[PDB]
mmCIF file of C-alpha atoms in Angstrom:
data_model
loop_
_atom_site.group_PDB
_atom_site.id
_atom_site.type_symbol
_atom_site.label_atom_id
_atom_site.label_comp_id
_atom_site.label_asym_id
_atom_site.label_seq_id
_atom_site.Cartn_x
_atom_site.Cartn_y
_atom_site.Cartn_z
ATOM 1 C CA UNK A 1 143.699 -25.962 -42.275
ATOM 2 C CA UNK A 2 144.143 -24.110 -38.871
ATOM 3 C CA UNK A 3 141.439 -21.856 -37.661
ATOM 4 C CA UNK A 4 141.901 -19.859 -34.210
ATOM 5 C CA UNK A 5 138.401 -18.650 -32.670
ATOM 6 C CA UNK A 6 138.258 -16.310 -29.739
ATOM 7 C CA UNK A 7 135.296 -16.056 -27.665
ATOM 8 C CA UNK A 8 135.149 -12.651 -25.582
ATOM 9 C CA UNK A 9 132.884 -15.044 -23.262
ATOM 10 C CA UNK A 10 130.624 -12.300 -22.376
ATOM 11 C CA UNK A 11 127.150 -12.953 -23.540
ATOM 12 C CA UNK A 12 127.885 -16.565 -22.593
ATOM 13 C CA UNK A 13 130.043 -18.447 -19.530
ATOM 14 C CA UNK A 14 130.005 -21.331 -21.131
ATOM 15 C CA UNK A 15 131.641 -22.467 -24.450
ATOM 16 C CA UNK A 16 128.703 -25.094 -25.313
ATOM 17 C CA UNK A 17 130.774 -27.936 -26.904
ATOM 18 C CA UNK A 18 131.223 -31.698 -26.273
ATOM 19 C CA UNK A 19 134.623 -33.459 -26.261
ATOM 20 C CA UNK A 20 135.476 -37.255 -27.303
ATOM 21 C CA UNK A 21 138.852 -39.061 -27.438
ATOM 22 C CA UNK A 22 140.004 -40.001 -30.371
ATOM 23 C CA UNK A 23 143.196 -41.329 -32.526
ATOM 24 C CA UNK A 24 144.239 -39.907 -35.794
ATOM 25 C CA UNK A 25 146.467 -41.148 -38.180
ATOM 26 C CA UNK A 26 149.211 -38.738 -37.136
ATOM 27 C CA UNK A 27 150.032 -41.460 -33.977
ATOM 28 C CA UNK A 28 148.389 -39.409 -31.031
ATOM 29 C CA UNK A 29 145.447 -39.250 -29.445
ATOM 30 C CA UNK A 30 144.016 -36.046 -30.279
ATOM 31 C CA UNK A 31 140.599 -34.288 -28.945
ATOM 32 C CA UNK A 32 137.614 -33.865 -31.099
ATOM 33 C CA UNK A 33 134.604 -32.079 -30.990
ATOM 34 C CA UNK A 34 131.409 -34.065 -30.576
ATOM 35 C CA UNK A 35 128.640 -31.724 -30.498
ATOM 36 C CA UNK A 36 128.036 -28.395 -30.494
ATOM 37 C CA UNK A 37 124.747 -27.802 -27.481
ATOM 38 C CA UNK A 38 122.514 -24.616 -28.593
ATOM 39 C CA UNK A 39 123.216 -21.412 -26.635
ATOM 40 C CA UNK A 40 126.790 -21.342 -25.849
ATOM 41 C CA UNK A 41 129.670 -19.476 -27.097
ATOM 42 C CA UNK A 42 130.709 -21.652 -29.759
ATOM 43 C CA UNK A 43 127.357 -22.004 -31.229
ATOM 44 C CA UNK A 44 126.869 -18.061 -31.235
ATOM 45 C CA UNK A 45 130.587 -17.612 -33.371
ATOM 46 C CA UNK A 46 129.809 -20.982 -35.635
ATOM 47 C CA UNK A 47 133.622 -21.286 -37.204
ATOM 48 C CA UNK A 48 133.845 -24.649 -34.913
ATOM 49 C CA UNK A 49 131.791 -27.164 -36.071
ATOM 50 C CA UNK A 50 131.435 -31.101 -34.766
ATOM 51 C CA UNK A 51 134.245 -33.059 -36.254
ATOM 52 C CA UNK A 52 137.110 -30.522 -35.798
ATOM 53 C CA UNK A 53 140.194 -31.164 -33.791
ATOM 54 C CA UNK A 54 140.745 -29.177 -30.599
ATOM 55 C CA UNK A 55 144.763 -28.440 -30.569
ATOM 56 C CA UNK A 56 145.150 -26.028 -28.129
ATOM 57 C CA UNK A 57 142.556 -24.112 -26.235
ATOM 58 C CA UNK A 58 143.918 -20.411 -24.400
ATOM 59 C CA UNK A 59 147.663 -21.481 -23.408
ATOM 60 C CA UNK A 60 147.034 -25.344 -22.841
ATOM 61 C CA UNK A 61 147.989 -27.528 -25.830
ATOM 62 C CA UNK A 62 145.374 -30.735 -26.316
ATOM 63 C CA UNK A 63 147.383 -32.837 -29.230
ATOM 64 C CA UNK A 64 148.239 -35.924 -26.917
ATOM 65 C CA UNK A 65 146.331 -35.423 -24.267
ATOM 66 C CA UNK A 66 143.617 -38.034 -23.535
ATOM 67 C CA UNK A 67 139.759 -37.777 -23.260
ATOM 68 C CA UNK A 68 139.692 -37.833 -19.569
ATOM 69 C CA UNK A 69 142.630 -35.058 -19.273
ATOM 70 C CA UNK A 70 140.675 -32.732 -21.877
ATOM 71 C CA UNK A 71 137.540 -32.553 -20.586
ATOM 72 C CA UNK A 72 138.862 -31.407 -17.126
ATOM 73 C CA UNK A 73 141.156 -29.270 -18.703
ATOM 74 C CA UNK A 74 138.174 -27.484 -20.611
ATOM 75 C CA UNK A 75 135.996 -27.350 -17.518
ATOM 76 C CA UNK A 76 138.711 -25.771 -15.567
ATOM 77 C CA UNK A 77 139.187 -23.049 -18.109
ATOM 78 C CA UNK A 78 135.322 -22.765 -18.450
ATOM 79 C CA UNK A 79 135.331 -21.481 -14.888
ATOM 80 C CA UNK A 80 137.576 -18.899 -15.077
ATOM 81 C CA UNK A 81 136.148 -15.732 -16.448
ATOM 82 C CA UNK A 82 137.639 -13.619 -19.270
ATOM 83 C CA UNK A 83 138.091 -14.675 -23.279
ATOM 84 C CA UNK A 84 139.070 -18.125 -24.420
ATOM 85 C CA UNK A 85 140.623 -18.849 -27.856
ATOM 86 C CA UNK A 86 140.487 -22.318 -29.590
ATOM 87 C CA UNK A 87 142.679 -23.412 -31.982
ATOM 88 C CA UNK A 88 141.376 -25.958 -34.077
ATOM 89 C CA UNK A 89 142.079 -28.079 -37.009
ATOM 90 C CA UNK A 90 139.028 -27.782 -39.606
ATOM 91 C CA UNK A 91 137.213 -31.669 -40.746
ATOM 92 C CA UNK B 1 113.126 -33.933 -27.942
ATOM 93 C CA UNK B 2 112.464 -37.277 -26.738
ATOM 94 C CA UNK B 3 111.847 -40.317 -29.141
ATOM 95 C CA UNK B 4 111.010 -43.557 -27.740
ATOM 96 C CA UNK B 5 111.631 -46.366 -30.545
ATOM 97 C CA UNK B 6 110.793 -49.606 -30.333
ATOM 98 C CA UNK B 7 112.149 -52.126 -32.573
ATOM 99 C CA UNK B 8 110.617 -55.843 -33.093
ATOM 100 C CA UNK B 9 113.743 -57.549 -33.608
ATOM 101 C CA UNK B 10 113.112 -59.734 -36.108
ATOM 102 C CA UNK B 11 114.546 -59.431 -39.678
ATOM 103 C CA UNK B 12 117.687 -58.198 -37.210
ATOM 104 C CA UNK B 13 119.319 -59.745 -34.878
ATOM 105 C CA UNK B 14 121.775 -56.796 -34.008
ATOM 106 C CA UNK B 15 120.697 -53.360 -33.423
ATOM 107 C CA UNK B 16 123.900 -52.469 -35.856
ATOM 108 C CA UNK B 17 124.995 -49.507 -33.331
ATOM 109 C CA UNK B 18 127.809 -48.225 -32.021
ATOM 110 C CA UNK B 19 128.298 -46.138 -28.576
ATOM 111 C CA UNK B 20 130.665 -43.292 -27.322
ATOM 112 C CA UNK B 21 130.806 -41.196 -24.314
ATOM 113 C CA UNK B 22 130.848 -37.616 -24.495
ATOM 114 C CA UNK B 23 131.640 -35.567 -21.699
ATOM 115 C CA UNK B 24 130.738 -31.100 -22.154
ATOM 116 C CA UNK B 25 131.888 -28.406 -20.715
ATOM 117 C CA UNK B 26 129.009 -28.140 -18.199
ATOM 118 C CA UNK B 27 130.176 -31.266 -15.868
ATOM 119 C CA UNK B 28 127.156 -33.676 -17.610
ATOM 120 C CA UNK B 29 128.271 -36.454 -19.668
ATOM 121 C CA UNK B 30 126.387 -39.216 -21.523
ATOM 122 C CA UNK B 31 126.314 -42.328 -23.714
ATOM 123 C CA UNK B 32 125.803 -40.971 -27.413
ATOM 124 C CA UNK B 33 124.932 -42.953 -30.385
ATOM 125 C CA UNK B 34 128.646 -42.854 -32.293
ATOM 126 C CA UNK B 35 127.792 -44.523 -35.721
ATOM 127 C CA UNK B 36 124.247 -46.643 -37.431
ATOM 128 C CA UNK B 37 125.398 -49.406 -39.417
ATOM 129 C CA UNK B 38 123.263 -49.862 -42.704
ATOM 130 C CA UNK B 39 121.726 -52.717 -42.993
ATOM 131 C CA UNK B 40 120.674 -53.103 -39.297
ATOM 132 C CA UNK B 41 118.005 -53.028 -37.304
ATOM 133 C CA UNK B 42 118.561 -49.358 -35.992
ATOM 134 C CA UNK B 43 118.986 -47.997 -39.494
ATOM 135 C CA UNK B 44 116.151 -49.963 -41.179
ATOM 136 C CA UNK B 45 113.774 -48.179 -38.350
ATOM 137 C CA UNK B 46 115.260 -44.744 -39.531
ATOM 138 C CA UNK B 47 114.184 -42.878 -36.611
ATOM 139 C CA UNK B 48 117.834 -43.097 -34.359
ATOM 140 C CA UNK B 49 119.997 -40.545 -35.683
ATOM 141 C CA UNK B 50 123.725 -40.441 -35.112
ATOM 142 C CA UNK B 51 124.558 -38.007 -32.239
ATOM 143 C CA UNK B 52 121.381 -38.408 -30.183
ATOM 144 C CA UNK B 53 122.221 -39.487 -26.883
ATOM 145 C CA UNK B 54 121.048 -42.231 -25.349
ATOM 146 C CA UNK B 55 118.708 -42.346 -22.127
ATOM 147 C CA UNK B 56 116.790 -45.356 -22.009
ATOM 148 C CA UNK B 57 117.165 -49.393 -23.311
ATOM 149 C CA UNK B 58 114.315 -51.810 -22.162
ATOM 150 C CA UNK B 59 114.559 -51.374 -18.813
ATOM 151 C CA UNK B 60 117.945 -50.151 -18.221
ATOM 152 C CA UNK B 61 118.771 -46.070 -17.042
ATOM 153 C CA UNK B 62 122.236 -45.329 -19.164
ATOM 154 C CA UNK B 63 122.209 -41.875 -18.055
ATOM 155 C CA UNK B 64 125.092 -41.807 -15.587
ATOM 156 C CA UNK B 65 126.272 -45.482 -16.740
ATOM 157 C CA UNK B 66 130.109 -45.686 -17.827
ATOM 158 C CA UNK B 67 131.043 -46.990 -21.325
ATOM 159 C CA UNK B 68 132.234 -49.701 -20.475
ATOM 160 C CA UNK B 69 129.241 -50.912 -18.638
ATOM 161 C CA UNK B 70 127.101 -49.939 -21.093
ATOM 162 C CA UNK B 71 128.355 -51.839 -23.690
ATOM 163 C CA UNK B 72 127.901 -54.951 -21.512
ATOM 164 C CA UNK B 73 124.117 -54.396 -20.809
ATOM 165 C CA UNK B 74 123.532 -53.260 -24.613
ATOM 166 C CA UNK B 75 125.547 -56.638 -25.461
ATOM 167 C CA UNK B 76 123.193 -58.511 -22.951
ATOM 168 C CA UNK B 77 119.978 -57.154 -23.885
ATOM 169 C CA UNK B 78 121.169 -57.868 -27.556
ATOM 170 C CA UNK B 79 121.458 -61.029 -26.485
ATOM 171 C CA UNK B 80 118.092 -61.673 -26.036
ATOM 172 C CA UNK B 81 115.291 -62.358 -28.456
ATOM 173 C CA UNK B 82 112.004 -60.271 -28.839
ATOM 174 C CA UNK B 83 111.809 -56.230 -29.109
ATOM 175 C CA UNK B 84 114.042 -53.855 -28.009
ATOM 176 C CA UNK B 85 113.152 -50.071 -26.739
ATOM 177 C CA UNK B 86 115.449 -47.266 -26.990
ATOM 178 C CA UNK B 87 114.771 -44.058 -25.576
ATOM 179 C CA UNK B 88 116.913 -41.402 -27.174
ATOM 180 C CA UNK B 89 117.115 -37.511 -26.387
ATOM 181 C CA UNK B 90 117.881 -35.576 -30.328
ATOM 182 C CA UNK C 1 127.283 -53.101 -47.217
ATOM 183 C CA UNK C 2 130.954 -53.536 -47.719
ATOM 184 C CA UNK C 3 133.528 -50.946 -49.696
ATOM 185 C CA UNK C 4 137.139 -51.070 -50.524
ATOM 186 C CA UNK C 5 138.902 -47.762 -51.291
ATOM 187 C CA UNK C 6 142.295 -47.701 -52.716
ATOM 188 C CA UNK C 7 143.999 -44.400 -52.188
ATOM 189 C CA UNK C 8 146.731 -43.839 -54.655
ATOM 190 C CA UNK C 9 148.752 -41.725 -51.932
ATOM 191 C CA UNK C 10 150.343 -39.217 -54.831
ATOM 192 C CA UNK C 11 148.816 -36.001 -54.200
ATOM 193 C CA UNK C 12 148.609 -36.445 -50.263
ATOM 194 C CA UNK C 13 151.066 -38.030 -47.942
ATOM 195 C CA UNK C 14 148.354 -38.425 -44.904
ATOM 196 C CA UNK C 15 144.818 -39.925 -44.834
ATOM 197 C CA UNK C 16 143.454 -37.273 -42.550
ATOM 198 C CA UNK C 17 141.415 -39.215 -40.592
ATOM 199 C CA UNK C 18 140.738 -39.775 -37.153
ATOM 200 C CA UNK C 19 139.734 -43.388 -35.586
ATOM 201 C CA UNK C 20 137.636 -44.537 -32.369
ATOM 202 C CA UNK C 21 137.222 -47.364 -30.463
ATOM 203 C CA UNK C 22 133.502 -48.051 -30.513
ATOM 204 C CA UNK C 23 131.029 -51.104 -29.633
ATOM 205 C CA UNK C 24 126.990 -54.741 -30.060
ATOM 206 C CA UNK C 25 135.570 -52.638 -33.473
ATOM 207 C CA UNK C 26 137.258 -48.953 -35.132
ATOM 208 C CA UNK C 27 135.229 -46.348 -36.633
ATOM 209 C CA UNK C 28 135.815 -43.427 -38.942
ATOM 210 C CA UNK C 29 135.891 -40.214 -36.287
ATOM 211 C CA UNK C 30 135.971 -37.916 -38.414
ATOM 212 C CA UNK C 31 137.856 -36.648 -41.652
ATOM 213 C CA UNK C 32 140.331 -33.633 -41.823
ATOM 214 C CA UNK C 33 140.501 -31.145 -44.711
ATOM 215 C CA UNK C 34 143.625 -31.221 -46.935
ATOM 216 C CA UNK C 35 144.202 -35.340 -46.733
ATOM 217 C CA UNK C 36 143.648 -38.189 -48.886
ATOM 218 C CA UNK C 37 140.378 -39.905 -47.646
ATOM 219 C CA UNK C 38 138.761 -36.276 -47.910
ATOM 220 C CA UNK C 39 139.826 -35.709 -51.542
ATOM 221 C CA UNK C 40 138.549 -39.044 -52.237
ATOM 222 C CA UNK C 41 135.271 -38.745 -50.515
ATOM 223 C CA UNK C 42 133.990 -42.233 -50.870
ATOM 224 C CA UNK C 43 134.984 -42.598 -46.669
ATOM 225 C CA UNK C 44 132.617 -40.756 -44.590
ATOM 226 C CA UNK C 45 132.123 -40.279 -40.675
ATOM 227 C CA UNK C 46 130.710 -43.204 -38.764
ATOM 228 C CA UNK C 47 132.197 -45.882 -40.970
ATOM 229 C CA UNK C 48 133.511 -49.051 -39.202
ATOM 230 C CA UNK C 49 137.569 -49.811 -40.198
ATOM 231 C CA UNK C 50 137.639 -53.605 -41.115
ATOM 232 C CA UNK C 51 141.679 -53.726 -42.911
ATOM 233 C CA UNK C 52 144.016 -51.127 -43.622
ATOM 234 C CA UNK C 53 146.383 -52.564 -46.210
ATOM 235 C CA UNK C 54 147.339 -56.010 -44.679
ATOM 236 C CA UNK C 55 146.414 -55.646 -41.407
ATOM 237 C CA UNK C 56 142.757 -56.261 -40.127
ATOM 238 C CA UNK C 57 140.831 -53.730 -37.319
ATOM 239 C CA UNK C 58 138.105 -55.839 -36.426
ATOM 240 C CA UNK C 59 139.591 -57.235 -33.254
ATOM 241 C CA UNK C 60 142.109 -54.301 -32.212
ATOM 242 C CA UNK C 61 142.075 -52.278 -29.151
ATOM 243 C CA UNK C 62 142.824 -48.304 -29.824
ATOM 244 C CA UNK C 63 146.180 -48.526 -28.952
ATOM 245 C CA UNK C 64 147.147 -51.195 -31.788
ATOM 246 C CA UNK C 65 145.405 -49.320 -34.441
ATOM 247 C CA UNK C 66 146.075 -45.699 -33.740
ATOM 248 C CA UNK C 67 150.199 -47.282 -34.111
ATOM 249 C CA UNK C 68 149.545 -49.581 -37.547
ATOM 250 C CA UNK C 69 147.958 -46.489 -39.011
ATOM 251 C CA UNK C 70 150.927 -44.492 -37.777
ATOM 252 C CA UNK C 71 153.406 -47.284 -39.421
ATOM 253 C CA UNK C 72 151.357 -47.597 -42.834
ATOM 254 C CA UNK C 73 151.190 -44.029 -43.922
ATOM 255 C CA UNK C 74 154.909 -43.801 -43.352
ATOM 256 C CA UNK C 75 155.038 -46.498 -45.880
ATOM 257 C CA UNK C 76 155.140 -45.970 -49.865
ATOM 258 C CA UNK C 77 152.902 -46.604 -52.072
ATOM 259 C CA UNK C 78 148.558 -46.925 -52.261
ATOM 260 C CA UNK C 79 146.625 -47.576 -49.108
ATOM 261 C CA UNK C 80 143.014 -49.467 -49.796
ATOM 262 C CA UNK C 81 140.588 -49.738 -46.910
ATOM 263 C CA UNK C 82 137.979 -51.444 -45.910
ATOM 264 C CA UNK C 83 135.037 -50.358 -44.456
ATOM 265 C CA UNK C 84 131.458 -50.860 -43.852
ATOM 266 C CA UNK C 85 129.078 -47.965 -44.721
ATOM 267 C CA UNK C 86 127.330 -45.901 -42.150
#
């Protein structure tokens, strides 16, 4: 149950999400989604929702990467401008 | 949405909570309530709701607080008898 | 307000579930589409892992029990869990 969103990241510059570390059953330590904060980009398409798995987000993959790594990662990418696409696996 | 709950304490001993920090993609992070056990003191109040962060305990600023820290002062103000106040943002 | 679920592990081979260190123990993070614990719905987000199979969660860091989950659903045969509601 894969579902790839991508944000043109026009209307907003920020995607609007929260990010906590967590460990599935799979053996790594994957990146979830939190929360979902009114007004940003991910809120506006609604496919993500809290409880989904962030895999990969533009080019940079997310599967073992560890709460602390993600949430710069994100907030790096957040910067830049032009679209961002999450890939995501659906709770 | 702030909610300022105060709990007496009494049929409870624990507040039957656990914490998580969430970092977002606009540089602010934040200690969140993760789960409500039932049967606690928390969920027998109702109010707390899982995903509300949380601001305020007694006396105690957890705003910019690390986890691990904050599970030490909710631990020690746990510790102690008499009511406890939790200031939560929805 | 304890629960044991037994999962027959037949119709899935994964639980789809992701777990969290939490503290005043490992909680239920959340639960994927297409696996086990979702088809059997009893499990929900929030609830606090107590014993997989043999082994107890109550006093495991994340790094134990992200690895004995890893090692029991590569084993045959049911899984029951034990949790405490949310």
């Amino acid at each position: 149950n894969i579902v790839t969103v991508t944000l043109n990241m026009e209307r907003h510059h920020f995607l609007g999400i929260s990010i906590v570390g967590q460990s599935n059953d799979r053996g790594d330590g994957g990146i979830y989604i939190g929360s979902i904060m009114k007004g940003g980009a991910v809120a506006a398409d609604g496919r993500i929702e809290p409880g989904d798995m962030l895999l990969q987000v533009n080019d940079v993959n997310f599967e073992n990467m560890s709460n602390d790594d993600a949430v710069r990662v994100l907030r790096e990418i957040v910067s830049q401008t032009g679209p961002i696409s999450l890939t995501v696996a659906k709770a």
